[PDB]
Amino acid sequence: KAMSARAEAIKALVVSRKLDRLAYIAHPKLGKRARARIAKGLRLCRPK
Amino acid sequence: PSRLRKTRKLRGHVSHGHGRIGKHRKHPGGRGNAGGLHHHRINFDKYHPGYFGKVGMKHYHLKRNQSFCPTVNLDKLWTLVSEQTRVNAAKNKTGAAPIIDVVRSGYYKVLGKGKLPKQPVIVKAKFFSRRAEEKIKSVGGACVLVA
Amino acid sequence: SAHLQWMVVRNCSSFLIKRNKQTYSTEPNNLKARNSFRYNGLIHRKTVGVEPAADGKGVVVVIKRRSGQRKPATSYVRTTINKNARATLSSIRHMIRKNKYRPDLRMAAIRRASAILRSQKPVMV
Amino acid sequence: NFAELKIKRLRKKFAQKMLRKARRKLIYEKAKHYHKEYRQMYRTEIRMARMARKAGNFYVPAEPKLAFVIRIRGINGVSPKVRKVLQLLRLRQIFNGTFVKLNKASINMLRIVEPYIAWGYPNLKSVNELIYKRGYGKINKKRIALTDNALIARSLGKYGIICMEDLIHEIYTVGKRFKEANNFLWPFKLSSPRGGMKKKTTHFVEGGDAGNREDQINRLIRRMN
Amino acid sequence: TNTKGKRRGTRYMFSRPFRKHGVVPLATYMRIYKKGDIVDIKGMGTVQKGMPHKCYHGKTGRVYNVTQHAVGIVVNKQVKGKILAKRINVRIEHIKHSKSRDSFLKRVKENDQKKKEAKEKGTWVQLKRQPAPPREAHFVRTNGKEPELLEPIPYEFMA
Amino acid sequence: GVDIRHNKDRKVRRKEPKSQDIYLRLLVKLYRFLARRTNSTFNQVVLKRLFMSRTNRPPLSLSRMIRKMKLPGRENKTAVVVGTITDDVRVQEVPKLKVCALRVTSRARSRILRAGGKILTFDQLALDSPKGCGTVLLSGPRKGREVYRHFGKAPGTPHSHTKPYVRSKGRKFERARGRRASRGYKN
RNA sequence: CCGACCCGUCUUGAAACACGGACCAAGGAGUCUAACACGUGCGCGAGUCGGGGGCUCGCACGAAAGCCGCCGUGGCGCAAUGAAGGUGAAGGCCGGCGCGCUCGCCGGCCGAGGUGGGAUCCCGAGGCCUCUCCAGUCCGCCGAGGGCGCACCACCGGCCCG
Ligand SMILES: [Mg+2]
Ligand SMILES: [Mg+2]
Ligand SMILES: [Mg+2]
Ligand SMILES: [Mg+2]
Ligand SMILES: [Mg+2]
Ligand SMILES: [Mg+2]
Ligand SMILES: [Mg+2]
Ligand SMILES: [Mg+2]
Ligand SMILES: [Mg+2]
Ligand SMILES: [Mg+2]
Ligand SMILES: [Mg+2]
Ligand SMILES: [Mg+2]
Ligand SMILES: [Mg+2]
Ligand SMILES: [Mg+2]
Ligand SMILES: [Mg+2]
Ligand SMILES: [Mg+2]
Ligand SMILES: [Mg+2]
Ligand SMILES: [Mg+2]
Ligand SMILES: [Mg+2]
Ligand SMILES: [Mg+2]
């Protein structure tokens, strides 16, 4: 009777920073799309 | 095997595993159990308490066969009979409890260590214990005596 | 089994020779004559060995058949190859690689075959 | 299927190569930032004292917090208290070197072994020469030469140290994980000081070599390694 | 050589402090002791009953038993090369609460609240007590006053 | 030189079975490879326990193993013991047990198989669960040997309950002085 | 050229003004038995052991090996405690009644208890995947937490005997 009394209270709800950016890119998971984007920008060339 | 001992490995060493200083004399500190009360009092008292003195009644011409009374516990009770014996009585609807003679198997007193299976069984023995008789009577078995 | 027999005779066999910090074995079907589980010629279900022919020309390639694992009279099949060197090595390589009969012994048997074949040309002074 | 699995592996290797490129560029820039940080401190210390002399007052520099301790005496005839402190400083041989973070506790410990050690306050250059030349990482209870940046990353990347420059910054400026960084380093096995010591059995202030020499440890380091 | 008496060489140890004779103050008898608390064995010489031995004088132990007029204390006594935990029955006059443990509980109650309070309003706060750090850089003024020159005094024969 | 203490440099531990049994060594060869080339620590525990002596591999009574198996959350799990399984004549209802062991008593073996159990050697267990998945690693009583009764403090010391060494048991053998207050002391 | 005293032995201390040793060859000193204790190896396993005896062509080997089973007498272990008369090792849970009186007769289950550690095992939130996405099948890997807990340790209980 104390567990259920506690339980209902639990469910009573509803700049660039270049160095910091570079570490984010170097993160093996966080920067996967980041380094992928610059990789395709190194090979593909398009005007405008 | 001679080749497996310290003697074959202690060649060339002058003390031969007994020290340059104290050496290996004939019998230091007496022979046998010498000085159990004077200079080996510590060792005798440390490892063998009760060693010195007399306790109790001396009994002349003790015959061990008179006191011969092998014991058996309740947990080992059903091992005296065949495996077929227990299952046949277990499955029987009639209350036919089997007869077990521990004297036949070589026991005179039935002790009451452990718990018995839930089925009646008749025990014949020269002696019982209060708890062994209690446990046997609890499961529907009866206790009889032999001489 | 192969391993079970090996542990029995890894150090207790008549073919075993131990001298001058070396170990050698002299069973008839041993390539390189060294005492090892891989190169033992009697404990495996399938073995291959190269020996000189009865005369001083050609070699004899002997193999173990899959049925006679307990009948030594018919346990082995022998044949004699007495062609040129390059063709002779090809047959031994083909009987090992293409047949997939203990492929690890490919180069070992060929080297032993090379030693035997060169041991039959006349000696020089 | 050969081309399909080949394409799969080429995608693997190219991504790994790009990741190494990303890691190298981070290493390059972090070293660049440290060089900016180093010259900031050097100019600031001068500038702080310069304005004091203009104002007519004095500027006391901060009490130095990094010390390098070198065992100078042998192991024969050492009292147990001195021996225990030396083992806590990982100086189990003559001419061993280690970095000690300075505080009340460490200073009193150095006081006990004052006859047996010679210690001072290394500058930036002294730290650079020690780590690059005599740097050995105690990896998996083994003394491994620090020949690549990857070895530091395998054991200190959780603390953010991934390059030799990162290690130098943590050693020089006492960082959050100085204890993990310094304990990771194998104790420095320095040579005998070329040119000879003055006298090892007496304190430096009395003309010998033991005890504390504030900035003169840099002179001793250059001859030692 | 030395006598094996229980109270040998305790002439000053069990002696009362100067001008501290007389009736024992009754605060000591009004102390309340539990199990697991930490006490320091003093060993006053006013009352000779329940006197701790000289080897336990000044040592520190933890209470495990309580009686009408004494407590049982577990104390680590060093013998030769080994330390083993002795149990001694000592009357309450010879002990007192260890102020070290009381301050330790004082810090812990302060520390747990600080974690509770700072987490509630957001900030991060230091819990571990660092040792004394090196003194940071600071300026020292002169206020138009020169530092006073100090010269070693010439020696003269004092007496 | 350096100031290090060499007395503890060589760790005193087993590396290989002292026995010359080829069958034991063969399955040691198997699990040595298993311990090296897998991640499951269950292989290492089995591997290092194969090096252990007979006294360090005590027999496991059938009653004790059944008691552990009957514990909740262990159903349909393969019991594993590195040693000898021993029959107990103090139990009657033998449940179905899938058990791997180095050695099983024949009367223990017959009871288990008659009760519907399954017996696998250690080589078969490796083919069954190479990672040791779904296994219960039991052991016999290490301190259940008689020699541990004598081990401990000296019998003459106070608060000692160790068995002294006596050639015979009786009222005349080590019961008088030091064992009763009527003679000297009792300690 | 540099370094270098004659060994063995007793000793805190030997090159000693300490004893033994002229040289050479051969011989020469921790063995066997019994009883213990521990460790290790093997077989069997709550049983183990034929060692005494007997049985097999009387015997080169073989004075060996093999077998006994109503030859297991017996030894050791499977029960201890007491001087002795003697006695002698199972409780956990759920119900009605006296009075659930610190309580006895039963009924039902289960079978050596509980606490804290405890390798190992199990469940497991959630993550790792491909040229991609909403669309979902198969198993593999990493893993916060949770559970059963081997042996063993420490403590609390419980039972046996005086
Ligand atoms: Mg020696
Ligand atoms: Mg002496
Ligand atoms: Mg006397
Ligand atoms: Mg010296
Ligand atoms: Mg020079
Ligand atoms: Mg000195
Ligand atoms: Mg050395
Ligand atoms: Mg040494
Ligand atoms: Mg001598
Ligand atoms: Mg002498
Ligand atoms: Mg003298
Ligand atoms: Mg002289
Ligand atoms: Mg003499
Ligand atoms: Mg002479
Ligand atoms: Mg001779
Ligand atoms: Mg015979
Ligand atoms: Mg009998
Ligand atoms: Mg006997
Ligand atoms: Mg526990
Ligand atoms: Mg108790």
Swiss-Prot record, chain A:
It is found in: Cytoplasm. Signal peptide: none annotated. Component of the large ribosomal subunit. Belongs to the eukaryotic ribosomal protein eL29 family. Component of the large ribosomal subunit. The ribosome is a large ribonucleoprotein complex responsible for the synthesis of proteins in the cell. This is Large ribosomal subunit protein eL29. The lineage of its organism: Eukaryota, Metazoa, Chordata, Craniata, Vertebrata. The gene is RPL29.
UniProtKB/Swiss-Prot annotation, chain B:
Its main location: cytoplasm. PROSITE patterns: RIBOSOMAL_L15. The modification N6-acetyllysine is found at residues 46, 54, 109. Pfam families: Ribosomal_L27A (PF00828). Residues 1-37 are annotated as: Disordered. It comes from the Eukaryota. Component of the large ribosomal subunit. PANTHER family: 60S RIBOSOMAL PROTEIN L27A, LARGE RIBOSOMAL SUBUNIT PROTEIN UL15. Belongs to the universal ribosomal protein uL15 family. This is Large ribosomal subunit protein uL15. It comes from Homo sapiens (Human). The lineage of its organism: Eukaryota, Metazoa, Chordata, Craniata, Vertebrata. The gene is RPL27A.
Curated annotation (Swiss-Prot), chain D:
Residues 1-31 are annotated as: 4 X 12 AA tandem repeats. Keywords: Acetylation, Cytoplasm, Phosphoprotein, Repeat, Ribonucleoprotein, Ribosomal protein, RNA-binding. Transmembrane segments: none annotated. It is found in: Cytoplasm. The modification N6-acetyllysine is found at residue 101. Sequence repeats lie at residues 8-19, 20-31. The modification Phosphotyrosine is found at residue 116. The modification N6-succinyllysine is found at residue 104. GO terms for molecular function: DNA binding; identical protein binding; mRNA binding; RNA binding; structural constituent of ribosome. GO terms for biological process: cytoplasmic translation; maturation of LSU-rRNA from tricistronic rRNA transcript (SSU-rRNA, 5.8S rRNA, LSU-rRNA); ribosomal large subunit biogenesis; rRNA processing; translation. Its main location: cytoplasm. Component of the large ribosomal subunit. The ribosome is a large ribonucleoprotein complex responsible for the synthesis of proteins in the cell. Binds to G-rich structures in 28S rRNA and in mRNAs. Plays a regulatory role in the translation apparatus; inhibits cell-free translation of mRNAs. Component of the large ribosomal subunit. Homodimer. Interacts with DHX33. This is Large ribosomal subunit protein uL30. The lineage of its organism: Eukaryota, Metazoa, Chordata, Craniata, Vertebrata.
From Swiss-Prot, chain E:
GO terms for biological process: cytoplasmic translation; translation. Keywords: Cytoplasm, Disease variant, Endoplasmic reticulum, Hypotrichosis, Ribonucleoprotein, Ribosomal protein. GO terms for molecular function: RNA binding; structural constituent of ribosome. It is found in: Cytoplasm, Cytosol; Cytoplasm; Endoplasmic reticulum. GO terms for cellular component: cytoplasm; cytosol; cytosolic large ribosomal subunit; cytosolic ribosome; endoplasmic reticulum; membrane; synapse. The keyword Acetylation does not apply. It comes from the Eukaryota. Residues 111-144 are annotated as: Disordered. Pfam families: Ribosomal_L21e. Residues 111-122, 135-144 have a biased composition (Basic and acidic residues). The keyword Cytoplasm applies. Component of the large ribosomal subunit. The ribosome is a large ribonucleoprotein complex responsible for the synthesis of proteins in the cell. Component of the large ribosomal subunit. Belongs to the eukaryotic ribosomal protein eL21 family. It is linked to Hypotrichosis 12: A form of hypotrichosis, a condition characterized by the presence of less than the normal amount of hair and abnormal hair follicles and shafts, which are thin and atrophic. The extent of scalp and body hair involvement can be very variable, within as well as between families. HYPT12 patients have normal scalp hair density at birth. Hair loss begins during the first 6 months of life and gradually progresses to nearly complete loss of scalp hair. The remaining hairs grow slowly and are thin, sparse, dry, and fragile. This is Large ribosomal subunit protein eL21. It comes from Homo sapiens (Human). The gene is RPL21.
